[PDB]
Ligand binder design. Structure first.
Ligand SMILES: Nc1ncnc2c1ncn2[C@@H]1O[C@H](COP(=O)(O)OP(=O)(O)O)[C@@H](O)[C@H]1O
Ligand SMILES: Nc1ncnc2c1ncn2[C@@H]1O[C@H](COP(=O)(O)OP(=O)(O)O)[C@@H](O)[C@H]1O
Ligand code: NA
Lengths: 368, 368
């Protein structure tokens, strides 16, 4: 845990060093902007404590030096008493925090603590999302996604099982720009009535003897995107509750009375024709129109021309690489065979079929 | 986004409300602890500003109330000038920050910004890792894991492909309590070239045109765990560079001279016998000794008795529920046939085979 202290006065560099060292941190000090630049380029300090004023340059602007040669460093500026216009200046330049002289040991240490947890708090979801397909129907969806995404209106994705409905949903979230999490709830894979609990969470023992609070998916999706997989499988009790949430923008946990406001973009998916389910009285009509302000239809795999080959090659590579196998080409015979299949399980079926092929691999894959 | 300002003074609650309102927040105020109690049990406030002194009770204690009735609320306490003593008490009771009157509007808004950052910075509490097995060899590994975990010494996990090495590694990370990321590096999937690049990172135009900075996995695993899948597939150059990092505890990126320090717990996995690779001169003794302070041997599926059935029933139940199917039972004949396979692909092979069965699933029983 390193901390670089940049300041003109010993009262700062010494005191702070005595304090930091006393608290488990390993301090270093620079007495000039020159000496500082040296140490920054030489070694990485998670946290840098910088005086707004320095002899050999503008302490504020020096933040740019740090921004340039140590982008991960979290900066705390020290500013003279009363002069906190400089402080804002620094903050807008990208400093994380500032301390006004004079300040106590306690105030210093607390700010340092937060500087380190700011350093320790980075998001790594750099993940790219693979959405393979060149059929005109798929290219049309790919062009539509970015147009739909920057809205907050809900999206209903219709398609057979295993057609990539979740991929499209993540893409939409990605493009929407929303900073919150992508929370997916499977409304079928979950027990009939555990659903209402997954969504709303519980607090104080909602289920038989718990007394331990748990956050619902609604809440976990705050400022993000909630993906409801097979929304058609929701109890008509849950449907009603979910509706009231869409309408009020708040809810309560199971067992609690505390009002909770959420901000979610709702994406739903179904392999049913929900307009037909409404007629059969198996799905609320008002909820349907709420959830389907925008719609996207994903065609079955067998309607996608030669995407079946594209996908096969994509899976064959991904698995052969990952299971250290030496089978990287599909035989022409194999390609013909794939094109003759119905794929009732669609991409999910294809993927599993190719993964199987690789698990039992040889030099090149042919088609039993 | 709601903020509750609990303060005895009218000028305070009015001013701060107006500032919050102007900045986009949704302020609410309470002039007494009684009034604050009412609003808190009824509304969730992501952030609560509380004066250490209140007429009708001790403000610092009121933190416990909040901590009990609104656990996820982040609290900023206001303190009189000099009476920072009392702020320390509040921070110790769980307050997140404190503001010493008098304070500027920027200081206030900067602290509020940070308090919402704190509110929004959360890890996905949901997290279950399934390690299915009741064979005495697997039960022993399960007892070992929690003990091995708490240490920082590296763990080497040996076993055939598909035996659950990555699973055990996450369990160890989990039980270890480390706060950083679990960082997976597949030493095989990656081309011999990207080897050094994935681990260490780079910055400016090292190889063809890479003027864009990239963080190594070493860096990304900071305070967390680095899983080296197939550690034996690392060339002798990297082996040495990696060895150097375990010795010193620091590194530089490629095309970089800045010394960066890491705190990582290393877990490595192999399907070879590295003691033999050393005799073959394929792997360094010294690195091996550093990586093998703790060892775990995962037995092939075929050496696990009836776990093959336990696993087959676990996957069947998982996939049938997930793919909306109703094949939930293994026939006695299926169980017999499973018991007679070699499972060269081990659990990976089994899992895929059962998913296959469920994807093509017809009735409620699987037989072939
Ligand atoms: N167009 C695609 N490109 C690449 N991978 C895909 C594509 N569609 C599906 N997949 C992958 O194949 C499997 C398809 O199942 P899934 O997308 O979950 O189906 P659904 O969400 O429609 O039920 C997933 O593992 C997904 O990662
Ligand atoms: N004992 C187990 N219980 C449940 N799932 C398992 C078990 N062992 C392996 N799996 C699953 O099997 C798949 C392959 O295991 P993996 O850890 O990738 O194998 P390895 O890392 O040994 O090559 C993974 O999806 C994993 O979640
Ligand atoms: Na290996």
């Amino acid at each position: 845990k390193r901390v670089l202290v940049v300041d003109d006065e010993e009262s700062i560099t010494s005191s702070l060093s005595a304090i930091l060292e006393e608290e488990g941190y390993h301090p270093d000090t620079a007495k000039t902007l020159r000496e500082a630049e040296k140490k920054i380029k030489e070694l990485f300090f998670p946290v840098i404590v910088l005086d707004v004023w320095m002899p050999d340059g503008d302490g504020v602007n020096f933040i740019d030096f740090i921004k340039e040669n140590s982008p991960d460093s979290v900066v705390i500026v020290i500013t003279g008493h009363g002069s906190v216009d400089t402080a804002v200046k620094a903050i807008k330049k990208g400093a994380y925090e500032f301390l006004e002289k004079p300040f106590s040991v306690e105030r210093f240490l607390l700010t340092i603590k937060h500087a380190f947890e700011e350093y320790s708090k980075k998001a790594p979801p750099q993940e790219e999302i693979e959405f393979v397909g060149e059929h005109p129907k798929i290219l049309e969806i790919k062009r539509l996604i970015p147009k739909i995404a920057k809205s907050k209106a809900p999206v209903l994705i219709t398609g057979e099982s295993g057609t990539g409905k979740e991929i499209v949903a993540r893409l939409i979230h990605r493009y929407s720009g929303r900073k919150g999490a992508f929370v997916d709830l499977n409304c079928a894979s979950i027990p009939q009535e555990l659903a209402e609990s997954e969504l709303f969470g519980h607090e104080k023992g909602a289920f038989t003897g718990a007394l331990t609070r748990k956050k619902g998916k609604l809440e976990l999706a705050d400022q993000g995107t909630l993906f409801l997989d097979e929304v058609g499988e929701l109890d008509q009790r849950v449907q009603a509750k979910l509706l009231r949430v869409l309408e009020t923008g708040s809810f309560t946990r199971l067992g609690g009375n505390q009002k909770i406001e959420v901000d979610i973009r709702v994406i739903s998916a179904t392999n049913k024709n929900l307009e037909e389910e409404i007629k059969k009285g198996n799905f609320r009509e008002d909820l349907y129109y709420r959830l389907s302000v925008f719609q996207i239809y994903l065609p079955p795999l067998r309607e996608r021309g030669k995407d079946v080959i594209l996908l096969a090659e994509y899976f064959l590579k991904k698995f052969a690489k990952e299971y250290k196998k030496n089978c990287f080409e599909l035989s022409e015979e194999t390609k013909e065979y794939l094109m003759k299949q119905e794929w009732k399980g669609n991409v999910r079926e294809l993927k599993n079929l190719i993964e199987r092929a690789v698990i039992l691999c040889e030099g090149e894959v042919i088609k039993p």
